[PDB]
Design a protein around this nucleic acid. Structure first.
Ligand SMILES: *P(=O)(O)OC[C@H]1O[C@@H](n2cnc3c(N)ncnc32)[C@H](O)[C@@H]1O
Ligand code: NA
Length: 642
DNA sequence: GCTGATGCGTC
DNA sequence: GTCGGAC
DNA sequence: GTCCGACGACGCATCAGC
């Protein structure tokens, strides 16, 4: 058809056949995908992005259904189902090396341009590949590009990085128009679309509803909404959207869903893809809540429970009929090999009447000598894969807080009151191994405030708050953040704030391109009279405040660092700043740092101290660097976490 | 055979 | 993980 | 409220470099 360079999936009255830029049965050109990404990136309304992607997907369904799965993965910037663990092994480092080689430029020139533009894609797009012959290779296809990404991910072992670079250079030699922009962005993990998983699902359900799969070509039905009123069409697409979303939340695996969609259609989907032990599901998440009054505003008169928010890692534990056990992370990564200790303890936690289950738990590092919870930083020293039981050094205690499936029954549509009762009755607590989350069922503001204080004294982050009977199910498609998280550091004037010195700035990427995206901060070490880097900072300022920072710090730029500023192994700022600006910064906790020099030697011989979840609060106009938080004060704050 | 750099996961 | 922007 | 993408610390697994 038309040249893909003119493809317009944002067109009014888009016709899936007549407005496609490829012919029936042809492989979807990658430029059609790139042009769709361009039209998505250009707008800010999600509904417009969804419509534009839906248009592409409808053409793929009508003309080239085998390319639906790769086009979806390209749009998500995924390589496959998360539990399979495919990794490119390519970050900005390898990518920039490949761009420099492909274009015949020095690495430092490419690296500087990428930082100034805030986007590796703009560098790859606007320089020619010097491996080009006079006549270019054939145009890239969507399935071809996706398969090359998978080729990169499958390369392993010694000398594999050079082989990955060879594939990347091969892609850039074949790119036309905007293709190199989005190839580079995909490899760097920054597509910049404004459209991600929820909008992709909305576009997919819309596409297969409007243009049904499986029709004989040319399709008799290219727009199944045309005979409906706008109102009826909206209700219908909402209903179809929810069928897809709820299925995906139970089975978040397009390798499973898309073959079924193409063969049987969306209405029959839940009959083929259902929640089942052994298939990871999307977990229920939590909305930050900045005080107890906000909890009551949110839940109104509905009864709720408060639970300790344990400071570990989420572990979704699956016991299949027949005895097999699998464990998955919050993001569906397979963690079974990480927890041989947990797997051996399953017979100890479940009563013998339990034949299958999916449990929702927090894995927390546990000191068996002292019988107490250990920090997250201890938990993260566990080995990750193919771990044998005898070698475990850091023991774990599971804190169980939900039950999603039991003895063949999905509990996703059941109220927490019932799920929790089934949990409490069919599982067995053992101190230091498997325990139900500490909880309080109350509506008393004074009791809740005291329970929050106690959770912190008992080594937890705060509270989780969950309704028991009103909108109390585990239906992620209806509300993915159905629980509330209440932390003391959310409250204004409560928690540890530090006054820290701005000693450097980093050029922004993406939404921050053309200004500063982050800053390097320092505490004041009284004893050496030096400023010591403590953390970087990149959230907490409004867009207006960030522009004010850019204009107020420009006069402080230095060509070289001051000799009394120490950053050791911290990332060197793009712009050094004369120490002057002092900012109020809040954090959740202080951590022992392998890189930052702040307070090194005061708590640990080799490690200084950094901030967990730092965020900007406000400028301290009334403070100069000498009155910033001292490194000794930092050490005192760390110690009193106990 | 060992260490440092990079990637990508956890929070 | 926190946060603010756009809807 | 939802969705999204800016940005944070940090540590294991892997591979480049030696
Ligand atoms: P994020 O800060 O969004 O918080 C959600 C995670 O908190 C962990 N968690 C600890 N303890 C609980 C309880 N009692 N209930 C729910 N979630 C809890 C989980 O790992 C969440 O992913
Ligand atoms: Na994130």
């Amino acid at each position: 058809s038309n040249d893909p360079s003119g493809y317009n999936p944002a067109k009014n009255n888009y016709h899936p056949v007549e407005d496609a830029c490829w012919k029936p049965g042809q492989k979807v050109p990658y430029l059609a995908v790139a042009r769709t990404f361009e039209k998505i990136e250009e707008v800010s309304a999600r509904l417009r992005m969804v419509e534009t992607l839906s248009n592409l997907l409808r053409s793929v369904v009508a003309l080239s259904p085998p390319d639906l799965l790769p086009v979806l993965y390209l749009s998500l910037n995924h390589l496959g189902p998360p539990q399979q663990g495919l990794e490119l092994g390519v970050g900005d480092g390898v990518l920039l090396k490949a761009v420099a080689q492909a274009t015949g430029r020095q690495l430092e020139s490419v690296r500087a341009e990428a930082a100034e533009k805030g986007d590796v894609g703009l560098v790859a797009e606007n320089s020619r590949s010097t491996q080009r012959l006079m006549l270019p290779p054939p145009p890239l296809t969507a399935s071809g590009v996706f398969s090359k990404f998978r080729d990169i991910a499958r390369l392993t072992g010694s000398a594999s990085t050079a082989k990955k670079i060879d594939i990347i250079k091969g892609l850039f030699v074949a790119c036309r128009h905007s293709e190199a922009r989005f190839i580079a962005r995909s490899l760097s993990g920054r597509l910049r679309l404004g459209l991600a998983e929820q909008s992709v699902l909305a576009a997919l359900s819309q596409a297969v509803s409007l243009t049904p799969p499986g029709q004989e070509f040319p399709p008799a039905m290219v727009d199944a909404g045309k005979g409906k009123t706008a109102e009826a069409r909206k209700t219908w697409l909402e209903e179809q959207g929810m069928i897809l979303k709820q299925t995906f939340c139970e089975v978040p695996d397009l390798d499973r869903i898309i073959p079924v969609l193409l063969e049987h259609g969306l209405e029959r989907l839940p009959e083929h893809c259902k929640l089942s032990p052994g298939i990871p599901l999307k977990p229920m998440l939590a909305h930050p809540t900045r005080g107890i009054s906000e909890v009551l505003k949110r839940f109104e008169e509905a009864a709720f429970t408060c639970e300790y928010k344990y400071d570990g890692q989420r572990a979704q534990i699956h016991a299949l009929e027949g005895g097999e056990v699998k464990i998955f992370s919050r993001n569906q990564e397979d963690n079974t090999g990480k927890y041989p200790d947990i797997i051996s303890r399953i017979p100890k936690i479940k009563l013998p009447s339990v034949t299958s289950f999916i449990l929702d738990t927090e894995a927390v590092a546990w000191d068996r000598e002292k019988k107490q919870i250990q920090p997250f930083q201890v938990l993260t020293t566990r080995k990750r894969k193919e771990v044998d039981a005898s070698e475990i050094q850091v023991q774990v205690c599971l804190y169980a807080f939900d039950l999603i499936y039991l003895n063949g029954e999905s509990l996703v549509r059941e109220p927490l009151s019932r799920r929790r009762q089934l949990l409490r009755e069919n599982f067995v607590e053992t101190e230091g191994e498997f325990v139900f989350a500490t909880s309080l069922d109350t509506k008393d503001i004074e009791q809740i405030a005291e329970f929050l204080e106690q959770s912190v004294k008992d080594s937890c982050e705060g509270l989780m708050v969950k309704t028991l009977d009103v909108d109390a199910t585990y239906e992620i498609a209806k509300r993915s953040h159905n629980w509330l998280k209440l932390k003391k550091d959310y409250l204004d004037g409560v928690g540890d704030t530090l006054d820290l010195v701005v000693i450097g700035a980093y050029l922004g990427r993406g939404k921050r391109a053309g200004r500063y995206g982050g800053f390097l901060l320092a505490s004041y070490d009284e004893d050496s009279e030096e400023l010591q880097a403590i953390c970087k900072l990149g959230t907490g300022f409004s867009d207006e405040e960030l522009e004010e920072h850019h204009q107020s710090l420009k006069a402080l730029v230095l060509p070289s660092p001051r000799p009394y500023v120490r950053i050791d192994g911290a990332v060197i700022p793009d712009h050094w700043l004369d120490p002057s600006a002092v900012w109020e910064v809040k954090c959740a906790d202080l951590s022992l740092s392998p890189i930052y020099p702040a307070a090194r030697g005061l708590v640990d011989s080799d490690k200084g101290i950094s901030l967990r979840f730092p965020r900007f609060i406000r400028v301290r106009e009334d403070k100069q660097p000498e009155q910033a938080t001292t490194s000794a004060q930092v050490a005192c704050l760390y110690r009193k976490q106990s």
